[PDB]
Amino acid sequence: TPLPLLKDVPSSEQPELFLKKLQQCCVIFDFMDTLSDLKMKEYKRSTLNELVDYITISRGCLTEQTYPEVVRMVSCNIFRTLPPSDSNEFDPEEDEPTLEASWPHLQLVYEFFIRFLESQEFQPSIAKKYIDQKFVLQLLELFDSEDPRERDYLKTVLHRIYGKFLGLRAFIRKQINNIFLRFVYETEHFNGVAELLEILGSIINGFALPLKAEHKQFLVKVLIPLHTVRSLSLFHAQLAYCIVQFLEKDPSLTEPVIRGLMKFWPKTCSQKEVMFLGELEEILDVIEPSQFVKIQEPLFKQIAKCVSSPHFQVAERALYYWNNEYIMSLIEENSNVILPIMFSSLYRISKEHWNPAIVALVYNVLKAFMEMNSTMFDELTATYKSDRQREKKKEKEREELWKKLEDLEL
Amino acid sequence: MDEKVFTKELDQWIEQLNECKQLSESQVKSLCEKAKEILTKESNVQEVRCPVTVCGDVHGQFHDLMELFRIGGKSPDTNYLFMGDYVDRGYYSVETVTLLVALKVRYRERITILRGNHESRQITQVYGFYDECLRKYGNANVWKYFTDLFDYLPLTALVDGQIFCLHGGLSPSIDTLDHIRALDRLQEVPHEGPMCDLLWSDPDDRGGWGISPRGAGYTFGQDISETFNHANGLTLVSRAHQLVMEGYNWCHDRNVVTIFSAPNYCYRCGNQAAIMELDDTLKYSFLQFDPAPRRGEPHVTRRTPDYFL
Amino acid sequence: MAAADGDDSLYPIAVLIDELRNEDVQLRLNSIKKLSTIALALGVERTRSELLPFLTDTIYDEDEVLLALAEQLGTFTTLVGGPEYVHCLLPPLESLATVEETVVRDKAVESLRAISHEHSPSDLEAHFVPLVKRLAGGDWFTSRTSACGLFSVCYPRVSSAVKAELRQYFRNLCSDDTPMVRRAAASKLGEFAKVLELDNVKSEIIPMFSNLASDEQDSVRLLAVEACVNIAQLLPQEDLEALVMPTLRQAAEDKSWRVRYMVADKFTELQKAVGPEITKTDLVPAFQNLMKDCEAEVRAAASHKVKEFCENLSADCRENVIMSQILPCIKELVSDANQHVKSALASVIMGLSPILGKDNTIEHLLPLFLAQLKDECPEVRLNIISNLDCVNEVIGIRQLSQSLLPAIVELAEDAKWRVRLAIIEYMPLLAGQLGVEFFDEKLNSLCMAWLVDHVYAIREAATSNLKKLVEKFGKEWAHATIIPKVLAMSGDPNYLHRMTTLFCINVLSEVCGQDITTKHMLPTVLRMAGDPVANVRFNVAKSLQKIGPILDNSTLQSEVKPILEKLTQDQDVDVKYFAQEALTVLSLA
Ligand SMILES: [Mn+2]
Ligand SMILES: [Mn+2]
């Protein structure tokens, strides 16, 4: 139905032409077929360009009668079932994403929507009847889109819905929890994890001082187990931001966070181990001394294992802790507790590591433990092979023990 | 008497590995020990006599290596010459490298395995072979055995005094083959120098020595290739190290040929693989092949988490 | 000190517990993995009263040792006192059924389902059933999704009073707010409905199944339609039309492609489990719609079921249904754009030949087989060549030679070697059915040309094909036709083609007989024993070992022994090894 432009019509017929244009934009074209209906796609693209920009400034064109039409328009355009993906894994630096092809229309529709919620005349008490729980359920389903441009637009749209409608905030967070729990414990197949973590990063940034037990359960039971999935390289920065923000708001939550990061420490993925070390440096950068001491023993047992790892990347990332001055200061305060944890590890890697760079770094770390807290060092190198005989006789004791256990069962 | 029973042991190991069944840690350790014993007597320029089938990168694609054996023939019936890059990126690096080392030990004169840029401790640790050993063996002993054995792999190979086979490319610190024979390869691949360049260099349309985008090695032009060939009496330089969509690629006016034997590289690139058969009188034949038809897809199970060890 | 007979031991338990909750992860993990030798060294009394309460209260460490302990306690029925004391294992395992990690709670529910039969009805209603109520009423989703798998193992052996309690408890588990446990409930829907009485599978299982089949998330609708197969296996053909069919009609034309793919993938399963008349009424238009679907995966799944669906129709209407409603969609599917659809259809299409009839497959099916034979994609080509024996049995061998033999001769030298391999593997049937005259005139050239193929697998296939052709035509025809060219290959300047002669002699000595293999093949091997390439030499040794049992001792001692002795003195090590081994196996040295 060839309709004219809104600038070529009077102000009386302006709202009814606006509504009619949205009705025409409820028609979906086939972009997988490149040559089909070429002229009418250009008509809808130009018509979408008229619809956007028009809604930007305060003008009163957003009457209540336009609310259901614009909701139905964007619902007919973006809401759909995503096609199957020929891939099961994704490599950011090598693998390439599959585009949606209807973007020359979807982008404008998304741009129309993100500006409709951002409109100066937008009223949420009226729009909540149409942007309901069923609408956002489909919207969060759209987050599995393989197109990163669509995922970025859905990021901003979901942030706008969360900020405008406060009655949906509990439902939004619960649905993201459902998405994250299925992504972790069932099927690892979700492309919008990084965007959802950015949304949550802003939400956690805007939390209350009396932190609800619901959000503490959200951090412990959902955010921490998210560290286990293999695709952690796709959202390590956003997850680290959410963890650091939770600790910046409640430093008392640093105990369940540390225990979680070491309960899920990477044992078969070295790049994941380096990411854990990089994230842990951030947690230790925003740590408090009274909270550090509470977990300093099992923590430094882990870094003692990390500095003693034969993986040069993990060893470098763990030995670079001794270059950060603040976490150095915490070592200087509790050296009599963590130096015996590190000593045997550093002296072993001072002899058994293959990388000459790593054996030079552990020498520098040992020189630090000698310049500071010397008496600890002297009475530990004096009780070196004495303790090494103790552990060696303990091992053969366990071995002959298990030999006798197998002798009794026979 | 012990040699015959170890021959039976090696045949059993090869039969087990031929169906993607890894060996034990002690088996791998003994195999690596005797492979060191064998490889220590080999020069940096390995004298190989024709006929032989030159293969490029494999990169842990075990079933694609089975396809390679289907194409070129089974060893020891068909003589082979691999040019490095056996592990990493593939899903079955352990099985592939173990099968190749076992075939080298069992059949000394039948195949010759060279060193690639991925037979280093650093590269195996960054690209996931060390992680694979961690999953399949529980500790880092097997990775240590294999990385210690990698120091014994010959740098280059000389087929019939004419074909110069090597993983990477030429080096500005290398003039004659005697310079290569003089190097001490019994060490981890350095970050620069003749040994590092021979495993990291690449050919290029850019004339003269250039800067390699990989970080290590150099980029040489056709003039350098033909100068090296006329100075060393070689008719062709066979190399790998680089992906080829066709499987094999001529360059520098038939002075250098790149051979890539990993079809559908990393299960994404969708490339053909190829091998170069050299007959009894050096008549080149290039066999291209697609990836092997992978088996049926069983019901995907919940994988063991990475914090399980 | 030791005991009179009782498993009770004076073994220090401290040195045992100093390894379970002590040391690093690997040592205690090995101790938990071996937590069975320590249970025998402690004794049933001490295991039940000193090691099980230990493991009950030690909520410690990561999930790996927890998984190991669950798997271990799955087999601890006898180590605690038998079916009398199994109830002491239920507490620890219960804690393992609430673990967050999926593998731990899954191994826990597995161990629970294993020892569920070890209880008596009293122990079930007194210990296990309360454990089920506790797990399925937890605050976190893990406990509920793990408890969803405990109903089928304790439902039939309990009283008729806790039946309604457990039924409504499972219903509450179905109407849960979190989709995580809703998915598990939809999965175990059928597993729990099979152990339910008929009066309960139609009054409470059908509404639950319909509700799950109309849920907001397709992720659970697909499991609902999956469990539909097990559910419809219980209602008679009179109730289905009112209880299972309304959900099926909407699941066939559903908005999500995933539940439609589940419908198409379990289409013939439904056809068999639900009835034949209704498939004539209901499922035929559903099949027509699924094969004409907008999604390509659904079209491939539907085309995969074409054969087994068509041959499972009612006997009387089949000839009309497939010809008037199924065949047009098949004609449309051969010209599809997606290659997976075409390949999946070609993998089953020829099975329609005996169902249609010789004239019907000639007029309607043969052009489609030809088109799929000339297809650009190699997978559809291989799949359509795979099932040629069926067509050859339905139509005539002469008709197959008229229509499809040129295409087979063309594919004999296809670009992809596996198509050539399929042609080679179909060569013996064609030879045996066409006769030695037609074969020697037409198809002999291809079989002899495959012997010098670039791919070694094709040469191996041709080597085996030579033996099969001999088995078809006779050792006399073998000596007349095959042997001269095989021996002529001994002069090839390529050792790869030269070893094919030895491989052919090896595969042909089994069928040509002592006389033929002594007068024609043995001289060639004995001459090849001096080949310059060491590969050919050790293959000569191996071939002599292979053909040995076919000659008489005079020939082994007079002509084979000196050759093997001279090969044992060669410069190469492998030829020496193989010659010595041949001497040992043939019993000559
Ligand atoms: Mn390389
Ligand atoms: Mn490579």
Numbering used by the authors:
A (entry chain B): 46 to 455
B (entry chain C): 1 to 309
C (entry chain A): 1 to 589
Can you quote the paper on this entry?
PP2A is a modular multi-subunit enzyme: One scaffold subunit (A) binds to a catalytic subunit (C) to form a core AC heterodimer, which together with one of many regulatory (B) subunits forms the active trimeric enzyme. The combinatorial assembly of these subunits generates a wide range of PP2A complexes, resulting in diverse substrate specificity and subcellular localization.
Interestingly our X-ray crystal structure overlayed well with an Alphafold2Multimer (AF2M) model of the PP2A trimer. Notably, the structure of the C-terminus of the B56ε-subunit includes an over 25 amino acid long alpha helix stabilized by the connection to the N-terminus of the A-subunit. The carboxy-terminal tail of PP2A C ending with the leucine 309 is clearly visible and wedges itself at the intersection between the three subunits. Concentration-dependent assembly of functional trimers was observed. We confirmed that the proteins purified from insect cells are only partially methylated at the C-subunit carboxy-terminus (6–8% as quantified by mass spectrometry) and that this methylation was insufficient to explain the observed stoichiometric assembly. Here, we demonstrated that PP2A formed spontaneously in vitro and methylation of the carboxyterminal leucine of the C-subunit was dispensable for its formation.
